[PDB]
UniProtKB/Swiss-Prot annotation:
Entry comment describing in which tissues the protein is expressed: Expressed at high levels in the brain and pancreas. In the brain, expression is highest in the substantia nigra, locus coruleus and medulla oblongata.
GO cellular component, one term: lysosome
Parent sequence residues shown: 58 to 453 of 501
Localisation per UniProt entry: Cell membrane; Golgi apparatus, trans-Golgi network; Endoplasmic reticulum; Endosome
Molecular functions per Gene Ontology: amyloid-beta binding; aspartic-type endopeptidase activity; beta-aspartyl-peptidase activity; endopeptidase activity; enzyme binding; peptidase activity; protein serine/threonine kinase binding
Family: Belongs to the peptidase A1 family.
Domain of life: Eukaryota
Domain comment as written in the entry: DXXLL motif is required for a proper endocytosis and retrograde transport to the trans-Golgi network, as well as for regulation of lysosomal degradation.
Assembly description: Monomer. Interacts with RTN1; RTN2; RTN3 and RTN4; the interaction leads to inhibition of amyloid precursor protein processing. Interacts with SNX6. Interacts with PCSK9. Interacts with NAT8 and NAT8B. Interacts with BIN1. Interacts (via extracellular domain) with ADAM10 (via extracellular domain). Interacts with SORL1; this interaction may affect binding with APP and hence reduce APP cleavage. Interacts with NRDC AND NRG1.
Disulfide bond residue pairs: 159-363, 221-386, 273-323
Induction of its expression: Up-regulated by the Ca(2+)-regulated transcription factor NFATC4.
PTM sites of type N6-acetyllysine: 69, 218, 222, 228, 242-243, 250
Protein known as: Beta-secretase 1
Length: 402
């Protein structure tokens, strides 16, 4: 349970994703690649772009092979598109292996790259079912496991930022670890608790209960997972279904009522500040998500602090103060346990055993009174089915799966 070479191999800027160094081609071309458990394509910038100072140059690689097939990926925010191919890929601060993987060479995009994020591509770590153009395009991790002796598991320790912040001109730097093929015991303390992967597409899980400062939200538990709940390193926020979001905001507002913030703050569109070092952490409640256990009728809870859901943003004009963005937001596509959740925990994506593990992170931000926690078991007599069944569209139904 030691993977020293892979420790601290993640970097990034607060709110702009965590990236790992990868190489593509022969000889190896280094790129910084966003670690994304909410998508399934390995897609890299492969043409000039205003926000890229470098890109994958297919012509420089002796081992590049064109698949003679394009790929077009629209999404809520924007789109990326390009040409499919294969090449040799390695992770310099990962396993000592080289694999031939599918690579989508991005030739055109809109609102994909982020000015100053310092990453040039995305490593989709989710399953084939959500790959583009379709599930026949083998994802990177599938190729890694098939071609090498790497165990079918990876783990993420995402370490967030905190005041005092170093710089007033740039965003806060973040760090973390992606351990490929194993669990590094130095990255967590206490017990490691597992929740089943409900279905292998996203890393989908089931939330059975939600508490805000130990107060149950008392909703039909299907509401917590409407229309899914997923663990996504490629989302910054904790994102909650509309009804759940509204209930949570009401509870957090009530707990923090000594302070009256503008509506903009609760919408994530405005910062609130306190004089350096005086942030009243204790007026903001803890949030507990109970996840279905491996055993029927069991659950465990992960508990996060305001140090996780209030994101530090240093303002140029207000550099004397500690300022924060509310990082819980409304979803219409289910619960997303993003960086806000993941920064509290060491998270084990145990694909081999179709389960996700959580343990208290050795790097999580906390104070002397409260800590992020992972606690269980909680037993429920005749526990209900909290899973939602997404209505089946005709187009989805028409798909053949040979
Ligand atoms: C929710 N989600 C996305 O919208 C997506 C979809 C994708 C098509 C891969 C394009 C993309 C680009 C940047 C970020 C990003 C991530 N973190 C910070 N800033 C931007 C996230 C994503 N991947 C995920 N998981
Ligand atoms: Ni058929």
């Amino acid at each position: 349970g030691s993977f020293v070479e892979m420790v601290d191999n993640l970097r990034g800027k607060s709110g702009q994703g965590y990236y790992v160094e990868m190489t593509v081609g022969s000889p190896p071309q280094t790129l910084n690649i966003l670690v994304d458990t909410g998508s399934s394509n390995f897609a890299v910038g492969a043409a000039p772009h205003p926000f890229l100072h470098r890109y994958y140059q297919r012509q420089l690689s002796s081992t590049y092979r064109d698949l003679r097939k394009g790929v077009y990926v629209p999404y809520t925010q924007g789109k990326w598109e390009g040409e499919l191919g294969t090449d040799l890929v390695s992770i310099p601060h990962g396993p000592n292996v080289t694999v031939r993987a599918n690579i989508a060479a991005i030739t055109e995009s809109d609102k994909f790259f982020i000015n100053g994020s310092n990453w040039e591509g995305i490593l989709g770590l989710a399953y084939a079912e959500i790959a583009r153009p379709d599930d026949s395009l083998e994802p990177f991790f599938d190729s890694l496991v098939k071609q090498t002796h790497v165990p079918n598991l990876f783990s993420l320790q995402l370490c967030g930022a905190g005041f005092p912040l170093n710089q007033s001109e740039v965003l806060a730097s973040v760090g973390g670890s992606m351990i490929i093929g194993g669990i590094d015991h130095s990255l967590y303390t206490g017990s490691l608790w597992y929740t089943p992967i409900r279905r292998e597409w996203y890393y989908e899980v089931i939330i059975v209960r939600v508490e805000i400062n130990g107060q149950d939200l008392k909703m039909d538990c299907k509401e917590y997972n409407y229309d899914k709940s997923i663990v996504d390193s490629g989302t910054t926020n904790l994102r909650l279904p509309k009804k759940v979001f509204e209930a949570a905001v009401k509870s957090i507002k009530a707990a923090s009522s000594t302070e009256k913030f503008p509506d903009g703050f609760w919408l994530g569109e405005q910062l609130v500040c306190w004089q350096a070092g005086t942030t009243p952490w204790n007026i903001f409640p803890v949030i507990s998500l109970y996840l279905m256990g491996e055993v029927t009728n069991q659950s465990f809870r992960i508990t996060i602090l305001p140090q996780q859901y209030l994101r530090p943003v240093e303002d140029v004009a207000t550099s004397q103060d500690d300022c924060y963005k509310f990082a819980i937001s409304q979803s219409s596509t289910g619960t997303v346990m993003g960086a806000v959740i993941m920064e509290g925990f060491y998270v084990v994506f145990d694909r081999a055993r179709k389960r996700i593990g959580f343990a208290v992170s050795a790097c999580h931000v906390h104070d002397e009174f409260r800590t992020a926690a992972v606690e269980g078991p909680f037993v429920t007599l005749d526990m209900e089915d909290c899973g939602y069944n997404i209505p089946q569209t005709d187009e989805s139904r028409s798909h053949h799966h040979h």
